[PDB]
Design a protein around this nucleic acid. Structure first.
Lengths: 80, 95, 97, 103, 97, 78, 91, 105
DNA sequence: GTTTTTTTCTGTCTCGTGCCTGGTGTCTTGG
DNA sequence: CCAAGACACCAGGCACGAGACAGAAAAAAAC
DNA sequence: ATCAGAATCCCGGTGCCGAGGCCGCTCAATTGGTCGTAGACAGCTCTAGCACCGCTTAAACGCACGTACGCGCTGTCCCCCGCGTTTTAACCGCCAAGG
């Protein structure tokens, strides 16, 4: 519960600065939280489905790798 | 004369089931054939990845189920899984 | 004292965070949010840490790209202040509805 | 035919053949093509059902592809599925930004 | 007499959202495609159905890219398009570096 | 050459897009982006036909090249 | 479960022979290599099934490398591949 | 030369790749020249990108390649960047994109 | 603020071996 | 007309350690 | 508002043409029968995922406060809409020669 509100405004600030964003409006943060949430919804749904067919109650890094390759947002680094 | 393929008569019958009083154009029938092609191809590719991320080479219906609910969005997918599962029961219950 | 009417703070920290390498969101609250989303489709699931680190990596990259195109939308808006419908236009063009 | 023995409409053995010649695995099970065929069957049923409603809208009897593109672009999950999909003689949503409507 | 501007354009928007027939007619489009095709290997014959495929895909492609560009300009507190708008939309999609 | 693209053609492209008011440099910019688009498409299409060892590009190869750019188009047997 | 580590070491000593590497750099490299191998191989399988050819020779691999990589990389890769074909075919 | 790698004068195992093709469900049969050809392409790609890796790591007086080096070397390339457009590196970040509207003038 | 220039203590990496498993030589036959 | 296999022969391939060795920072310390 | 009048919609009409019925084939689905190992399953073992807490500390939160880009407004000036005036793209049968 409420770890969606565990997203801090200075973290959003830091992401804007590495993102290169200079000026920050105030109506941004919860919109950011909602987009991040829907993203992670689709991600973990697919990863857990890959683990559903895996017949193992633990999800691996490889699972999340394969699932994000399925979305085409494909990330290297951890093998897969 | 080389014999070419179509799926026109099958989905044609299905259309006649769901709408008896309805015509169709030929190009759209080809479009639906391409539609079946595309969906089948994405499913089969997910099946091959199911194989290689499971290190197995047998294909059962369980892999098809998990492939469909990997590809298709939720509510539509669960209805389709229901249709397929009831068909599995009706076929394999008999011969 | 040396209060400094602004400009060096933001851009200097941009220079620092682009000299940087590692993450920005710290670990535990992100992990707990992940498990709360995870507690919704199949209960009681266990995880290795590298999966979570990949999730954090791709999450921050996703948001970085959102911020970049949002920044260019703002620059085309002849403003430096961001807006929410900037992000909505960016995700409209990205086809991720 | 196994399709009739499954009480369905798509030919099983053609699909069983195409699974073999697709290099899709090494071996092919018994009823996996039945499940896949039923999936196809419900998909095309839903799609062309909305297409039939689209023809009901325009009061047309023969399906034009414009009906197909419209029925794709109306429903949510279907349009998120076929996002990277376009169709010849497709067209788009009849859509007007009302901020560009005059006053 | 004279009509007041903007009206006829939107009326033909309502007209041109109806027929999905091809906008660019055939012969000049065919010549352009043939001329670009000339410089890979000399004088390749063509299927006319393939030419129609190229025509369809090109026109739908450009229409959708116009839609995103138009929404960019609507966000830009303006009504008229600019080439910089096309640059912004392409920069979001990622054709050019 | 590239100037076979008429002004009212790109205007009609705005109309089916639904775009109201048009600037100047739009036209040449449009022709350029269309050119690069067709360049990549027909390049890999002729690559397909090069492997085909045949002197006519198939509509099939056009379709598969569109798939290769993730631009899947139905309708013409694909 | 083999990675490609000493292969990378030998390529590296053939190019910048005074250069170290981290572990995770090697991991990203092998991720890269596997991605490229899978993309080319699947595209070659598409060549087979789109062309009804029951096997795959080197010509399919050449045209697939054309289909994936753009111009300069493609031409230099075709050159290197044909040179390897030449030297392996000679002996 | 007993080994085909020595018969090719290269650095990758070819019969590895041939077994990968066989244990791939890729084709039914696999010829003799295709695995050699593909492995040579792979070896060229490795050497080519590791060139930009070597220069990008040498930019900072560090003997070891870091992931930030790899992302920099990719984004400073044109063909590799359009290659890796949908691609993200772990521990990557992005380029210095300081807009001209931002510097104190 | 930036950045440079000393130790230091220090994490990884390359050398170093043994075990082993896939890699290799070649005919038949067939597609 | 040479791969598939099928069998017969095999030195490499990698896991584990060691000691060293490139390296991040502590902290003066200029611009 | 409010009328005149362009612009569009919408209703028989007919025509023509391809969708759909239809019908006689033949080749893959079937049917049945025969090896075989892949995997469903039982079970062993040790790792690692989890939970918990104590200590450290740097990181967030609230507020004080100026302040300065965002914005509503303004004037302005200009340059696309559009309607008018040709105009060349492109698909086509005489009429000269002319031999």
């Amino acid at each position: 519960r409420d770890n969606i509100q565990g997203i801090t405004k200075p973290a959003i600030r830091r992401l804007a600065r590495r993102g290169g964003v200079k000026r920050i409006s105030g109506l941004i943060y919860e919109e950011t939280r909602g987009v991040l949430k829907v993203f992670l919804e689709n991600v973990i749904r697919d990863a857990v489905t890959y683990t559903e067919h895996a017949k193992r109650k633990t999800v691996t890094a490889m699972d999340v790798v394969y699932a994000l390759k399925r979305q085409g947002r494909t990330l290297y680094g951890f093998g897969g | 004369r080389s014999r070419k393929e179509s799926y026109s008569i099958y989905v044609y019958k299905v259309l006649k089931q769901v709408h008896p009083d309805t015509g169709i154009s030929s190009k759209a029938m080809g479009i639906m054939n391409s539609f079946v092609n595309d969906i089948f191809e994405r499913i089969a590719g997910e099946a091959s990845r199911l194989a290689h991320y499971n290190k197995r080479s047998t294909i059962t219906s369980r892999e098809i189920q998990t492939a469909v609910r990997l590809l298709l969005p939720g509510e539509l997918a669960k209805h389709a899984v229901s249709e397929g599962t009831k068909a599995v029961t009706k076929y394999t219950s008999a011969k | 004292p040396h209060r400094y009417r602004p400009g060096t703070v933001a851009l200097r920290e941009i220079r620092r965070y682009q000299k940087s390498t590692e993450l920005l969101i710290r670990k535990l609250p992100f992990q707990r949010l992940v498990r709360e989303i995870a507690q919704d489709f199949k209960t009681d699931l266990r995880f290795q840490s590298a999966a979570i680190g990949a999730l954090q990596e791709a999450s921050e990259a996703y948001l970085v790209g959102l911020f970049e195109d949002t920044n260019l939308c703002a620059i085309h808006a002849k403003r430096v202040t961001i807006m929410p419908k900037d992000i909505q236009l960016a995700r409209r063009i990205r086809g991720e509805r | 035919t196994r399709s009739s023995r499954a009480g369905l409409q798509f030919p099983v053995g053609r699909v069983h053949r195409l699974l073999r010649k697709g290099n899709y695995s090494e071996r092919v099970g018994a009823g996996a093509p039945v499940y896949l065929a039923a999936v196809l069957e419900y998909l095309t049923a839903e799609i062309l059902e909305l297409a039939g409603n689209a023809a009901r809208d325009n009061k047309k009897t023969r399906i034009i592809p414009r009906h197909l593109q419209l029925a794709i672009r109306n429903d949510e999950e279907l349009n998120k599925l076929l996002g990277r999909v376009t169709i010849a003689q497709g067209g788009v949503l009849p859509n007007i930004q009302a901020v560009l409507l005059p006053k």
